[PDB]
Amino acid sequence: SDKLKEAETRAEFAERSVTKLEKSIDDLEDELYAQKLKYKAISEELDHALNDMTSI
Amino acid sequence: MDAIKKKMQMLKLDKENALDRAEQAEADKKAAEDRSKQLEDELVSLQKKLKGTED
Secondary structure, eight states: OHHHHHHHHHHHHHHHHHHHHHHHHHHHHHHHHHHHHHHHHHHHHHHHHHHHHHTO | OOHHHHHHHHHHHHHHHHHHHHHHHHHHHHHHHHHHHHHHHHHHHHHHHHHHHHO
């Protein structure tokens, strides 16, 4: 019974830790999505300036 | 970006104004030279008429 309690406690902590890690990776994935949007927008604006200047 | 576009627009406004002024000056030169040459032809005809009167 004592060993079962110990193992259950460690497994519960492991579940909590993996939940925290999954939330953290969600946050960082969202941040990378935002920065990818930033690069898309800046490249699009540079292309717009290029086409405006080449087309006067 | 942002300032680059505005600077390009300034460089284009200068382009349009300079080109328009050049074209207008060229038209002015054409008109003025045509005026001068027609006056010279009138002068020539007057010389010939004077010659006939002298005869």
